[PDB]
Design a protein around this ligand. Sequence first.
Ligand SMILES: Cc1cc(NC(=O)Cc2cncnc2)cc(O[C@H]2CC(=O)N2)c1
Ligand SMILES: Cc1cc(NC(=O)Cc2cncnc2)cc(O[C@H]2CC(=O)N2)c1
Lengths: 304, 304
Amino acid sequence: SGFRKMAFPSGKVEGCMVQVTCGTTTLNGLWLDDVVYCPRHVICTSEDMLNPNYEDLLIRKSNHNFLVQAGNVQLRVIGHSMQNCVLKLKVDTANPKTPKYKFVRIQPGQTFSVLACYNGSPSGVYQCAMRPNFTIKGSFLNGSCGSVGFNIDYDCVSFCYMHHMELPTGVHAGTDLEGNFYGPFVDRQTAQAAGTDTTITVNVLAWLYAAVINGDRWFLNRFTTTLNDFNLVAMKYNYEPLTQDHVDILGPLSAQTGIAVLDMCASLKELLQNGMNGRTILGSALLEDEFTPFDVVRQCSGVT
Amino acid sequence: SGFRKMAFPSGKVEGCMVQVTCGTTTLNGLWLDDVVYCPRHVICTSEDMLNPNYEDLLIRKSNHNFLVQAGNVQLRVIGHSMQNCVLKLKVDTANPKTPKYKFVRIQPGQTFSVLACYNGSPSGVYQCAMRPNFTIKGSFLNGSCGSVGFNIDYDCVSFCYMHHMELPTGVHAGTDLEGNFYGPFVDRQTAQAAGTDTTITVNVLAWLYAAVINGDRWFLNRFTTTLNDFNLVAMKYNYEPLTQDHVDILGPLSAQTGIAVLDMCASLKELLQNGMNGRTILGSALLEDEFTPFDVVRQCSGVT
Ligand SMILES: Cc1cc(NC(=O)Cc2cncnc2)cc(O[C@H]2CC(=O)N2)c1
Ligand SMILES: Cc1cc(NC(=O)Cc2cncnc2)cc(O[C@H]2CC(=O)N2)c1
């Protein structure tokens, strides 16, 4: 029993972290096979960041200008290219610690672990959700760019995120491993609006099932609702509308607890309308939305 | 910016996890050098757990009865001994993945990362605090015994916890790596009282400094207090009394924010007396106490 914001074991990703230096800028790179991936803004100086012409900036760079270090050993750069907002530095050595991996573009509402890095060295690991507005509420400082988000299935690491920037609002923006930003963000030092964010309804319901599994049942009530009635409440409270796809994904948790999904929706409706009355659910005084139905089942079943 | 319950990168500890089987029982072991450490209750059957005589049970066991597996390879057990509540299985092979390590007995209020394991395989990593009542509020299921808690300084892993049991209340109990339980707990299936727990005052203050550093300043006020006045409030709300040692440890955070520790105490006093009024601090609707002053500085400075 117990429920925690649990991250994947980070070992397979730690063995991929390298430091990338271009001129005066140092950030993190991801070394998989004979390729090192990093944010393309590593080629920018302070004056460039305000409105960079990455194509022009990258033209003044040669392979020998990209300094790639894996721990204490230097890697030899034999090729360089830009793919969207990432640079791909071809090195002459395949990473012997390269795990089985895939590059995936996660959906909003999905979760992943972040291995925060500085100078190619891992500092910590935490679990994040890709917000509906395509931002992540991470913990990153200057030098953290190039840190990655991932999921692990058996022995396969699915890299889904690479950190690029912090918006003036303190939230984080980044790309998939092909360098395509999540959201409308551009890699330029201009104020950028992240959209209105919503609460991930299916995740809050999944966490309510996790609460029931762990003995916290006070919020359960004698009520039910319909998808339409519940969605009127969800819109009022900036929650994502619940669909039959979400109800179907909640199926295993509904079967495990014996609580019909629409009955759980009625509990959530009452919690939204009346608050928590100074009580807690799984040690939290607010409705948690950064656990997917899969995360709940995995945590509550002990998947290794 | 941003503040998360960040765990240490778990890689150095993943390379130490093994599976230990004795008869019908399987749990996790920690392989360091040529020794495997695991909870001694691995030698118990269902009937034994209620009141085990570990000395008598261990006498009926030989080296060949302890089945130790590291991934897919079997380790040869050449010695076995009991040290308090842990078994030490001497194997004929030193772990080639053994990091620089120490065994430490952490103090209550201190934090550590837990690598939750099943069948010797890591499933996840999360940050915990050793509660003042010597319990941990973890996330563990059957099979998780033998999972360890640790801290990392540079390249040195300080193992501080080994998981042994879940009390009927859902909280967790375990030992240091010499097998000495934290708290009054015994490894027997009898209902055990964990003491009254208190909130780790110095950690809540450290987290309030983390909030100020990250822009959340609403709770700051025009008041101050004394250690004695603040401690009268702390006792009323089941908070640990604040000492000059705690004020001194908060020194760097006080210097960084320019907020005198007793002024932060007055903010905490008002938050205790008046609640949060439906507002949040670092995305939390309750006062967080599982971040030490060291964790705040480390996270807010990017220590790798
Ligand atoms: C190419 C680029 C890089 C960075 N760098 C950073 O944030 C560095 C960093 C990352 N994370 C936490 N702390 C620090 C900012 C950029 O624009 C700001 C304007 C906006 O919005 N974002 C644009
Ligand atoms: C030697 C021993 C082992 C276990 N085993 C477990 O809890 C297994 C486990 C661990 N963590 C989470 N879920 C499951 C319990 C014991 O006594 C209970 C009476 C009490 O209090 N504790 C005594």
